[PDB]
């Protein structure tokens, strides 16, 4: 728990473009035939994402949250299972947290004490706790696998005036390029800022000796951009303009 | 029948009919070309 | 208890008007539509026409335009239904129905049921006259009787046996219609403890012409 492993060493920050990706449902409100303009804080088209990559290599850096973040997590044997949201990562403030025990996904806010780095087999105790969260129940499994990757999975978490608002969508397919959208899923009035955040992995043995599979995920920032939406009779976003790139 | 509708907090007048189309779950309403409310999910039970 | 109303049966000849009641009770008048379903025997239901009883405007079939004529009365909460001209074909069951509207409409109430016979034939009371064996083979322990209504018009009558008493061995036939006529017979079959204690008379009702008939076996 407190103790870290001994086989983690350092790995660069290498870059990969995203091509038409970043681009979710803006709003609920079914749209049919039109050209829609949504001013909203967007990932610029043609920009960089830094290239992570954990396989004896592993990278887990601590990046700061200014308004948004998108996450392009693409597993094989799902390596994260929670994330680490907060401000100055002690007992003092309020910091957001997502517990996933494989029934169903906790989250919860609450006086979070952290470890400098803590592993998953997060906190000594916690207490006052403004929040909870209960989600549907569901399966996944643990176990190790190396190869190639079928999936991909694409978590959106923003900011929007205290709430914080999660869009996802998975498909079947290092990062093979496209166009999709990304249904609603859960919005949570937390209301508590955060300006960090850093990667939780789950590990696997046959915190010690602990070791890991092969994934990569991806971070992405967000800017004040317009973008001008398609909408087909189904509702379904097939292309994404962005007006000040070309 | 033309009626008045409330609808959640959200007025209007019109008549109800069947929904042909595919849409979200969490939908409220939707607009039309026109961008006024042309569909309307039932606050009750899920029902457009 | 929301439950709609109608009466029994109704007689009409052809080339007149007729006009029926549904009567509806526990809920507001003008909250709800009214829908009528005919019930043709062997053809299976048919559906008359659907009001509005607040704006009273009326929503009819192809078919069945200029025959009916649907109005309410919002004072009573009572809907009606006003035939013009029926024929031989028209003769019929008749429903009333409230739709409640929530998504797709279903059927939740209906009525007693009214049974229309478009006819110029008069209204006869029934002559009722038992029947009975007069004699026994001894090959059997109980003992069976029966009624016989014949002469009257219009169809359904009531037939009880010693006034509703005997509620189980008990058969109701259907009526065959002859020469603007009407028989029908019922049978009965009771252990041998019974007959010299009790006797069985045959109890017709005759719910048109208002004559109850009673005669002993």
Same mark, same amino acid.
């Given at each position: 728990?407190?103790?870290?492993?001994?086989?983690?060493?350092?790995?660069?920050?290498?870059?990969?473009?995203?091509?038409?990706?970043?681009?979710?449902?803006?709003?609920?409100?079914?749209?049919?035939?039109?050209?829609?303009?949504?001013?909203?804080?967007?990932?610029?088209?043609?920009?960089?994402?830094?290239?992570?990559?954990?396989?004896?290599?592993?990278?887990?850096?601590?990046?700061?949250?200014?308004?948004?973040?998108?996450?392009?997590?693409?597993?094989?044997?799902?390596?994260?299972?929670?994330?680490?949201?907060?401000?100055?990562?002690?007992?003092?403030?309020?910091?957001?947290?997502?517990?996933?025990?494989?029934?169903?996904?906790?989250?919860?806010?609450?006086?979070?004490?952290?470890?400098?780095?803590?592993?998953?087999?997060?906190?000594?105790?916690?207490?006052?706790?403004?929040?909870?969260?209960?989600?549907?129940?569901?399966?996944?499994?643990?176990?190790?696998?190396?190869?190639?990757?079928?999936?991909?999975?694409?978590?959106?978490?923003?900011?929007?005036?205290?709430?914080?608002?999660?869009?996802?969508?998975?498909?079947?397919?290092?990062?093979?390029?496209?166009?999709?959208?990304?249904?609603?899923?859960?919005?949570?009035?937390?209301?508590?800022?955060?300006?960090?955040?850093?990667?939780?992995?789950?590990?696997?043995?046959?915190?010690?000796?602990?070791?890991?599979?092969?994934?990569?995920?991806?971070?992405?920032?967000?800017?004040?951009?317009?973008?001008?939406?398609?909408?087909?009779?189904?509702?379904?976003?097939?292309?994404?303009?962005?007006?000040?790139?070309? | @029948?033309?009626?008045? &509708?409330?609808?959640? $907090?959200?007025?209007?007048?019109?008549?109800?009919?069947?929904?042909?189309? @595919?849409?979200?779950? &969490?939908?409220?309403? $939707?607009?039309?070309?026109?961008?006024?409310?042309?569909?309307?999910?039932?606050?009750?039970?899920?029902?457009? | 208890?929301?439950?709609?109303?109608?009466?029994?049966?109704?007689?009409?000849?052809?080339?007149?008007?007729?006009?029926?009641?549904?009567?509806?009770?526990?809920?507001?008048?003008?909250?709800?539509?009214?829908?009528?379903?005919?019930?043709?025997?062997?053809?299976?239901?048919?559906?008359?026409?659907?009001?509005?009883?607040?704006?009273?405007?009326?929503?009819?079939?192809?078919?069945?335009?200029?025959?009916?004529?649907?109005?309410?009365?919002?004072?009573?909460?009572?809907?009606?239904?006003?035939?013009?001209?029926?024929?031989?074909?028209?003769?019929?069951?008749?429903?009333?129905?409230?739709?409640?509207?929530?998504?797709?409409?279903?059927?939740?109430?209906?009525?007693?049921?009214?049974?229309?016979?478009?006819?110029?034939?008069?209204?006869?009371?029934?002559?009722?006259?038992?029947?009975?064996?007069?004699?026994?083979?001894?090959?059997?322990?109980?003992?069976?009787?029966?009624?016989?209504?014949?002469?009257?018009?219009?169809?359904?009558?009531?037939?009880?046996?010693?006034?509703?008493?005997?509620?189980?061995?008990?058969?109701?036939?259907?009526?065959?219609?002859?020469?603007?006529?009407?028989?029908?017979?019922?049978?009965?079959?009771?252990?041998?403890?019974?007959?010299?204690?009790?006797?069985?008379?045959?109890?017709?009702?005759?719910?048109?012409?208002?004559?109850?008939?009673?005669?002993?076996?």
């Amino acid at each position: 728990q407190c103790v870290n492993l001994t086989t983690r060493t350092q790995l660069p920050p290498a870059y990969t473009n995203s091509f038409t990706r970043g681009v979710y449902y803006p709003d609920k409100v079914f749209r049919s035939s039109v050209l829609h303009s949504t001013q909203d804080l967007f990932l610029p088209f043609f920009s960089n994402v830094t290239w992570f990559h954990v396989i004896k290599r592993f990278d887990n850096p601590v990046l700061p949250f200014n308004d948004g973040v998108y996450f392009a997590s693409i597993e094989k044997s799902n390596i994260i299972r929670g994330w680490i949201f907060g401000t100055t990562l002690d007992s003092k403030t309020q910091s957001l947290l997502i517990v996933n025990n494989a029934t169903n996904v906790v989250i919860k806010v609450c006086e979070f004490q952290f470890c400098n780095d803590p592993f998953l087999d997060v906190y000594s105790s916690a207490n006052n706790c403004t929040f909870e969260y209960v989600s549907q129940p569901f399966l996944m499994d643990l176990e190790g696998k190396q190869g190639n990757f079928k999936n991909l999975r694409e978590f959106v978490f923003k900011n929007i005036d205290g709430y914080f608002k999660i869009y996802s969508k998975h498909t079947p397919i290092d990062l093979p390029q496209g166009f999709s959208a990304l249904e609603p899923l859960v919005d949570l009035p937390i209301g508590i800022n955060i300006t960090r955040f850093q990667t939780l992995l789950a590990l696997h043995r046959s915190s010690s000796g602990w070791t890991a599979g092969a994934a990569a995920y991806y971070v992405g920032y967000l800017q004040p951009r317009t973008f001008l939406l398609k909408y087909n009779e189904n509702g379904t976003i097939t292309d994404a303009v962005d007006c000040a790139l070309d | @029948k033309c009626v008045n &509708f409330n609808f959640n $907090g959200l007025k209007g007048t019109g008549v109800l009919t069947e929904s042909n189309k @595919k849409f979200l779950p &969490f939908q409220q309403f $939707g607009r039309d070309i026109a961008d006024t409310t042309d569909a309307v999910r039932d606050p009750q039970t899920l029902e457009i | 208890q929301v439950q709609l109303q109608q009466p029994g049966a109704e007689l009409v000849r052809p080339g007149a008007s007729v006009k029926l009641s549904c009567k509806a009770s526990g809920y507001s008048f003008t909250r709800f539509w009214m829908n009528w379903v005919k019930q043709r025997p062997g053809q299976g239901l048919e559906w008359i026409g659907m009001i509005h009883p607040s704006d009273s405007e009326t929503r009819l079939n192809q078919k069945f335009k200029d025959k009916a004529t649907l109005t309410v009365d919002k004072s009573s909460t009572t809907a009606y239904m006003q035939l013009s001209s029926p024929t031989s074909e028209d003769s019929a069951v008749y429903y009333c129905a409230r739709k409640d509207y929530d998504y797709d409409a279903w059927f939740a109430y209906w009525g007693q049921g009214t049974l229309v016979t478009v006819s110029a034939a008069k209204t006869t009371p029934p002559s009722v006259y038992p029947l009975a064996p007069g004699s026994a083979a001894q090959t059997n322990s109980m003992v069976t009787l029966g009624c016989l209504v014949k002469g009257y018009f219009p169809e359904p009558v009531t037939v009880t046996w010693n006034s509703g008493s005997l509620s189980s061995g008990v058969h109701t036939f259907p009526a065959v219609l002859q020469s603007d006529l009407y028989t029908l017979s019922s049978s009965v079959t009771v252990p041998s403890s019974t007959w010299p204690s009790e006797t069985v008379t045959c109890n017709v009702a005759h719910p048109a012409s208002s004559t109850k008939v009673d005669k002993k076996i």
